[PDB]
Design a protein around this ligand. Sequence first.
Ligand SMILES: O=P(O)(O)O[C@H]1[C@H](OP(=O)(O)O)[C@@H](OP(=O)(O)O)[C@H](OP(=O)(O)O)[C@@H](OP(=O)(O)O)[C@H]1OP(=O)(O)O
Ligand SMILES: Nc1ncnc2c1ncn2[C@@H]1O[C@H](COP(=O)(O)OP(=O)(O)OP(=O)(O)O)[C@@H](O)[C@H]1O
Lengths: 988, 291
Amino acid sequence: IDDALYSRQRYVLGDTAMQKMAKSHVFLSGMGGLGLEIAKNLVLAGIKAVTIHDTEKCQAWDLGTNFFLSEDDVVNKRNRAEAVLKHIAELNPYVHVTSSSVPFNETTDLSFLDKYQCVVLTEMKLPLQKKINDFCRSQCPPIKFISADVHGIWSRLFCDFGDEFEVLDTTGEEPKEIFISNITQANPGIVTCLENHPHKLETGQFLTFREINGMTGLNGSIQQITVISPFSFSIGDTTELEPYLHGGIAVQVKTPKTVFFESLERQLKHPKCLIVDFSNPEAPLEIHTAMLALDQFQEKYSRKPNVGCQQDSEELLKLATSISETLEEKPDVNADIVHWLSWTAQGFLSPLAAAVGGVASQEVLKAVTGKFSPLCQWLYLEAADIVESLGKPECEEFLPRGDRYDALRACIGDTLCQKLQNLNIFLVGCGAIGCEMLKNFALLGVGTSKEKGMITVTDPDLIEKSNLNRQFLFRPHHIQKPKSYTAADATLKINSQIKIDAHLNKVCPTTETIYNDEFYTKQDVIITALDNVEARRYVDSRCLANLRPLLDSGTMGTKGHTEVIVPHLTESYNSHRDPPEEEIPFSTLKSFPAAIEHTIQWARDKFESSFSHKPSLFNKFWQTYSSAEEVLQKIQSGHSLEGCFQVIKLLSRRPRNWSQCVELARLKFEKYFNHKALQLLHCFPLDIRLKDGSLFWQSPKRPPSPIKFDLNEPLHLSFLQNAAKLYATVYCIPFAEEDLSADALLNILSEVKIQEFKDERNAIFQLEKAILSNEATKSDLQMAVLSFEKDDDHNGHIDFITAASNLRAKMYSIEPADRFKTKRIAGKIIPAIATTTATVSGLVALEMIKVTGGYPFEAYKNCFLNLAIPIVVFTETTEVRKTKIRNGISFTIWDRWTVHGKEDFTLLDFINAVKEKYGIEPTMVVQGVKMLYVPVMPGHAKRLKLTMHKLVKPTTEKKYVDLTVSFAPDIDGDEDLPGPPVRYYFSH
Amino acid sequence: LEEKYVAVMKKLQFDTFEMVSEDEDGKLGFKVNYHYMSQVKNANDANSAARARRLAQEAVTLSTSLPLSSSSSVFVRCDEERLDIMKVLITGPADTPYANGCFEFDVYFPQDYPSSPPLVNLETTGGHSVRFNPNLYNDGKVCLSILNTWHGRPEEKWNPQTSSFLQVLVSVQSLILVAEPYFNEPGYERSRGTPSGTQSSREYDGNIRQATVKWAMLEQIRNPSPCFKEVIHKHFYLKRVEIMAQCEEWIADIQQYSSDKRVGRTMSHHAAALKRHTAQLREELLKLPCP
Ligand SMILES: O=P(O)(O)O[C@H]1[C@H](OP(=O)(O)O)[C@@H](OP(=O)(O)O)[C@H](OP(=O)(O)O)[C@@H](OP(=O)(O)O)[C@H]1OP(=O)(O)O
Ligand SMILES: Nc1ncnc2c1ncn2[C@@H]1O[C@H](COP(=O)(O)OP(=O)(O)OP(=O)(O)O)[C@@H](O)[C@H]1O
């Protein structure tokens, strides 16, 4: 497993899942849009062998749904499967891809399918799906079966993994760790958790214990729990065991789970659907009824319903009514859903196809690996809200016209399509989500109008090797190139009429000059694909000042969320100020570690302090003062200096050659992993007790122990080598790779002794000694500065950090960690995968249509999903909140007051103007973080007689500034009432 | 004397001083040493607005509620334009090893204040060579429950609704600078009253006394910070006789245990260092001009 390509995916799937992914063959049938999306996601995932199969030929109608075909392919009438074969293999050279075109029918021999292990069907008639599903589930072992289809704005997903399926990880969350406080010799026994820190457990789970004093019988055993209180639970009889002394650690144990499925034919009479919107829990049954009626109609008449022909709608409604009474549950018939399905039967919506494809790819991964809990047993996604607000459009608006947008026009109508081609949309960040959004834009024809339309994408980063796993628009020969330019070039190939303007800037306050308010006013919607909260907050504040809709999304592993912000209707991003996160206490990180995270963090901080901060201080100090003799003279005159002791100590211990570097590394190792333990034990002996008598070295504290150096231990050798290399680099001492051999290290260390374990004059003496030794040359006052680079496999950073963390952990008798986990923790790498990004991109693309159409408040939705469970939740966006201050005056977050002044305007004039215009008098004026008028602090009383122009010191380009004000509360002693921001104009 | 001391100092508890100057390019030029330079320069975001309201409300309290007495007092300075920059000077209480010291702190307010507690850093560490207290690490980090955010206890955290800066200051002065700092460390209170504990406490007290005489009075007089220059000069000028008496008593008390064997060498070393410091401090005080 080349980690340089699958670094992000391993943290989600796991090594065993990766191994099972190889040696797997997947058969995929039907090369429409949905099949193409599924194939792309699977190939990016890393399946060994994928076979695509199709029998039709390319048509001009296909150009609106397939983002790999071309005009030439349509001209040559190539088979659809072959025309995409070459491009798909370009995504991943490690994947073997083959195409097939054997016809499918009732008399086709299905014997050849047994070679594969998972079958995906798309654009297939129902009876053949029934036959295939019956055949597959009867194999030994059974072959997994998945079906999916998209018609208009409705989708259907189905799964079947045989009679019995086994899951090796129900949820995928890492088990937590708890500390036992007290045990009871009772039947059943009672276990009390430590003070605070609720166990957060539930009855029926299984735990195992270790490191228990007295009750040695429970160490290494497995018990099933019963929650009694948030801080305690129950375990079986313990009356036959010794009394509990102290200590004890329990960790959760995962247990395999078995699920059951049914045949497709059986499931058609009472499906076990999945609820995605709790406002209408009965919707999936009605959607299922309508889809079944549509399939029956298509079988009977050998064609799909024509739009606007009311007799087809009546026939479909009658069929749906006939089917509904046959269902076991006997639901009702939704006339509206049937009507709309009849209306747009021949359409195809790209973002819905993308979302369904992402979900289906995740399902296939679950089927092949058994990593997570599978879907059971249906899923019905739809986007009815898009056409719910159209009222009663005419049929002529949906007729095809003979271009690449026929599918979309049949979906939503001509007017909305035209309003789409004139969008000016500003996109921030070009990460994984950005590429999918660009693909969706190209498919929808966003901004393709000649007169108006432009897409702006800005990103300062460069293409990296690990980025090729998730972003499909990049190629191996695109490494070390701007993301924006490569993305623009890739997108222009999909659609020739797309007009894209690309930049390289990073959205930040410093670059605000180019992204002035006129630029934001020109835009019509802002979409964010960032990865940090500060940029999100800054962009949200910028958009709030110009009344522009904002769409935000983000993913993490198998979880993702979407948020929609509309002016004058919903709350902003900053209205959701989130809670903070626990930070390791200073004393747990420094002297009393308790988990591998603490040691990793300590190693990271030690690396930073030793190789970044100290070199910077050294260089700054020695550039402040020209000569060392001057520094010595100033010291001898009693003049104080900043940090003089530290820099002089660094100067005294400067290495000169390779041997000195090795000796320095050895001394650092000894000081770090030998003397600290002895010092800590000397200060606190093992038997010291507190006031209540409990031992000080109790949980969660762990006693340390010294480690003796030994060159034969591989960990010791690795740490020594990495430290030597880093110090040689920092002090700029040349070295060769042969000097890193074990034998050379043995030879150098053969004559190095170790000191046993137990100011101004000394510093002056050492400085004078350095001076008389001609060690104070200009070259000597120079030290290279290193920076953390987790993606480099030869700088030795990760090796050093891992070795140090493992050594410190073994000092405190804690389980060590491997290289990959250490890298993930130190670099704070966010795990990611393609399916979730594709799904959230599809959902954002759906919401953009509603934003463009100017639909009322009820149409917008927010989605939170977790594919691991799986679970999808749709909620209405948070409503705007009224806030009042006094006298019945109220304001929202979107309000903003204005004051017009002139050249001779004074602060008192401003106060009086606000008081007259809005009715209340402010008591404090602050420009951003720089204050202007605070009565409490001295000297501001006289500020009332100053020109505003002097007091603001503005820039000539800006004709106005924004201020924040507050008002005196009605009752004294209370915090001042906040007010809406006020914009001040210098002149008319 | 105490009445005059209270009367004179009461006009200097709160004021403003110029620390940051901005050029035409918007770059920030600091005229005094500040520990949080990088955070100030990087965090240029102007989204924060509730922080300004909270600080403006706090300025009402800080103008009048600061403790002020002969034993201890607090002095605060803030920038002439920005509101997230402050420097605090605290005089050590009486009858403690930190008696009549002058300790300087740096306070910075994050953007999301008051949702998060402010940052505090001790500056009178003597070049990181001295650990003044078990809660005051020699690197300058000051650790308190109220300034930390972790599991702990719900009433032992930075509560945005009730916690205030004045509480932080009073807590520091009342809990960090105490009579016997040696017993602040948990796990030593068990040995309280034992002869060994008393001997260890005496050794720790001697070390702290010599360290504070060195790095809290002499260095401050020779190289006062620009912000608190006048306060320092007026403070030391008014209490020279008491300072001399206290130093003489400290020198006398230390030698009482020089005949011991377990800690005799350390006590003798501390006494010699204290004598060497006091010899120069006497000359420095004799040359101080009248403010
Ligand atoms: O600068 P830091 O990263 O905070 O590390 C220091 C530093 O150790 P290193 O230079 O080996 O990194 C100190 O040594 P000096 O550079 O000041 O000589 C050492 O002090 P000792 O030599 O007295 O051990 C101290 O350890 P301590 O605080 O226990 O005195 C230790 O701090 P950490 O290792 O805990 O960071
Ligand atoms: N302030 C900003 N201005 C512009 N682009 C930004 C800003 N902050 C982040 N970005 C962009 O956001 C993108 C995030 O992409 P993504 O989440 O896929 O991961 P990444 O940054 O490429 O790296 P990795 O996956 O290793 O974390 C990056 O391409 C980065 O350039």
